[PDB]
Write an enzyme that holds these catalytic residues in place. Structure first.
Site, mmCIF file in Angstrom:
data_model
loop_
_atom_site.group_PDB
_atom_site.id
_atom_site.type_symbol
_atom_site.label_atom_id
_atom_site.label_comp_id
_atom_site.label_asym_id
_atom_site.label_seq_id
_atom_site.Cartn_x
_atom_site.Cartn_y
_atom_site.Cartn_z
ATOM 1 N N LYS A 52 -9.298 8.658 0.548
ATOM 2 C CA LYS A 52 -9.836 7.295 0.451
ATOM 3 C C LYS A 52 -11.293 7.283 0.880
ATOM 4 O O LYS A 52 -12.010 6.314 0.581
ATOM 5 C CB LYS A 52 -9.051 6.337 1.315
ATOM 6 C CG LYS A 52 -7.581 6.170 0.896
ATOM 7 C CD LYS A 52 -6.950 4.974 1.628
ATOM 8 C CE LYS A 52 -5.548 4.641 1.145
ATOM 9 N NZ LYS A 52 -4.617 5.771 1.327
ATOM 10 N N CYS A 87 0.789 -1.239 0.000
ATOM 11 C CA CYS A 87 0.000 0.000 0.000
ATOM 12 C C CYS A 87 0.830 1.304 0.000
ATOM 13 O O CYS A 87 0.264 2.393 -0.066
ATOM 14 C CB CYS A 87 -1.061 -0.068 1.109
ATOM 15 S SG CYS A 87 -2.294 -1.333 0.628
#
Ligand code: K
Ligand code: K
Ligand code: NA
Lengths: 422, 422
Positions: free
Chosen positions: A344, A171
């Site tokens: 996000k 990530c």
């Protein structure tokens, strides 16, 4: 020791097929999280994701960015490569950097990555081989699956013959790619770098994998746009997404000399490890804290100077709280007015593409003097002591930005960007 | 600019489970290529590979390098991680670098990669999910499959909390990892780096993939040890292999101050792109030629100074010839006595681990003043004009070594090492 600027942006995200549409939607508070429809999710506890539009009329199409002669070969590649090539094409064209001499091509390199890479390609190819049981797969299987064939195809497309490399750090991938590409220019090994991340992880085994790791929100399947809620008390895991974010980085004099667009300067890069657990974050946030801290020391700035922080901010119980405490420890006393948000909240967690997509959003916050919102922040966790830009975008002075990415394996990357004129 | 030395070596190869056994077998002209037995190859045109010993008595075992309490977790990971952790454990222990203190741990980073990574894990898990069709996979699936969890686990094992990164560049991976790790130390971002590559690509879909790309030798299945024959007229493709090669790199003063063993100095690194084709090497060898040339320029040496070249040398028709012509162009006039060999003649092509394994062989050639043989070089191609160390190892003066690695996507890496005695 060279200065490094940002001269091109490229985006394929769940809220837009290019930078302009994506950024308008982010700033307007639009969510790109949707119901999964391309495969059967009846046995998957998570049924939603940040997905690229694929409607007949307005959807993502290779033809939108690929000459007729090259479509066939590109179509054989994994979607992470489709997305990556589309973002890089936009970034390259935005930058105007289309060298047609040997020296300029040789001084152009690439660091393009993915966290997982060709997951669908490997999954589908494996199942099909098991079904046909004839020892035969497509001649395209290997290159279609290789993380480095994104760098390969962009290199081929434009003739870029400098370093042809990747970063692969789960990530944090997109952030390490950009930081490493900056370092390459800083130390004189390249004049221009194509850098970022791409991911297409929303497959049956991909979603099942993250469900099994207990990483995903499984309780908002009827209201997908409410699932990703960083620092909200009802948060219960991230939402997977897909897409790509690619930038052109360039040595500063080189950019100025050719009249390039200049979005900002990359001035700091921190990269650390938790050294703690395969999937759980360091309980004290030691790695995350150090990455942020080192990024600023690398930039020769102090924490009061940061105006806006694009968080990792995935909507996990542990991760959001650990990041929030590390940020507040570093910033609260010296910079109590600092803004921080997670995009996000809008597009989900694009895994290896997250860091680069968010790096782009960070640069656009500087361009437009606006901090994008943390959507769904209805009931902030008690520990919150700074402005998390809940619900609605906020126009403000933005001269320096910090962007964080953390990943499995305890790998952390932080980047600092500054506006040119300040 | 800091000087960078090699202070630890680690190997898991088809001819040995550690450095000493592997290197004795290489020098002695032993081959590690054998018939594949772990899965059904009746429908595969290539039936052989360079394989790690897995016999009950002498075979590879986690227990050999992993404390009892950590075996369970490690056993859930893909074999590329098992091999990587084993090689890194050997390298770290060889170097004596086992810091307990925070500053030293924070200055220790990792760049550990794979070309394909967790291929068996994804293949098996995908097939099994397709079969069980219950929406469930192991909780360990994602970390077990991620390339960066090799760096993750080694970081956890030793507390190394510096940069936690990877390189992923197909068959050049292990070389880019080491070169990038050197650059990290050179420019002051770390004092010690754990670097290299690991690969476990010999699976049904892996072999089928390379067969379909027409990359593999399919004509020596009855005589496996004769298949890999670089520059031989009967060459017809590479033989896949598995294993890992990891090194400890260290800033020179830091190494001296603690009394470290020093194998050599990494002085040059070239990294280029062909920008030509997804899988075929540039027909004029431009990328390969430039990588070699740049590695020497980066080292501030001239081509007469190289004593031995560890070739990429995969036993392909086009590739071997292209590398040979590029090498002869660069070296023939200035260094007609230069030695060059391919150790893939013995262990096959370890893909992402090739470059780091071969970097280790290169260092050992300096330690033992011996060039390893190109096995199977019975009928050299007509273009050969230098000593390819056919058949048998050759002792000679070796103070500077060049090692090449080329990969799909047109990516090229060359590394230059010198004896620390000069
Ligand atoms: K971020
Ligand atoms: K080599
Ligand atoms: Na010489």
């Amino acid at each position: 020791n060279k200065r490094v600027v940002i001269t091109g942006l490229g985006l394929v995200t769940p809220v837009g097929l290019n930078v302009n549409s994506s950024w308008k939607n982010i700033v307007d508070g639009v969510s790109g999280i949707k119901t999964i429809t391309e495969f059967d999710t009846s046995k998957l506890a998570c049924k939603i994701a940040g997905l690229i539009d694929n409607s007949e009329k307005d959807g993502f199409k290779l033809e939108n960015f690929t000459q007729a002669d090259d479509i066939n070969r590109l179509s054989k590649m994994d979607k992470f490569i489709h997305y990556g090539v589309a973002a890089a094409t936009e970034a390259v064209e935005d930058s105007g950097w289309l060298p047609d001499d040997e020296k300029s091509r040789d001084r152009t390199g690439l660091i393009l990555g993915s966290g997982i890479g060709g997951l669908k390609m490997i999954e589908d190819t494996s199942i099909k081989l098991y079904q046909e049981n004839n020892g035969k797969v497509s001649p395209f299987f290997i290159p279609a699956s290789l993380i480095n064939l994104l760098s390969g195809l962009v290199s081929i497309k434009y003739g870029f013959s400098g370093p042809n490399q990747t970063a692969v750090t789960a990530c944090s991938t997109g952030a390490h790619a950009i930081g490493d590409a900056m370092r390459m220019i800083k130390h004189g090994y390249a004049d221009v770098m194509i850098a970022g991340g791409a991911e297409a992880p929303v497959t049956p085994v991909g979603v099942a994998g993250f469900v099994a790791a207990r990483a995903l929100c499984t309780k908002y399947n009827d209201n997908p746009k409410k699932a990703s809620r960083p620092w909200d008390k009802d948060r219960s895991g991230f939402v997977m997404g897909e897409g790509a974010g690619v930038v052109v980085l360039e040595e500063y004099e080189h950019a100025l000399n050719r009249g390039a667009k200049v979005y900002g300067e990359v001035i700091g890069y921190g990269s650390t490890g938790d050294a703690y657990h395969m999937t759980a974050p360091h309980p004290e946030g030691r790695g995350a804290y150090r990455a942020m801290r080192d990024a600023m020391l690398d930039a020769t700035i102090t924490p009061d100077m940061i105006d806006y922080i694009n968080a990792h901010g995935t909507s996990t119980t542990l991760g959001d709280g650990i990041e929030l405490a590390a940020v507040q420890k570093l910033f609260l006393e010296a910079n109590p007015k600092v803004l921080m948000s997670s995009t996000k909240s809008s597009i989900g967690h694009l895994l290896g593409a997250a860091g680069s997509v968010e790096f782009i959003f960070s640069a656009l916050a500087i361009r437009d003097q606006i901090a994008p919102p943390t959507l769904n922040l209805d009931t902030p966790m008690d520990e919150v002591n700074i402005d998390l830009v809940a619900l609605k975008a906020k126009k403000t002075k933005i001269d320096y930005v910090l962007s964080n990415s953390f990943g499995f394996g305890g790998t952390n990357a932080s980047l600092v960007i500054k506006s040119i004129l300040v």
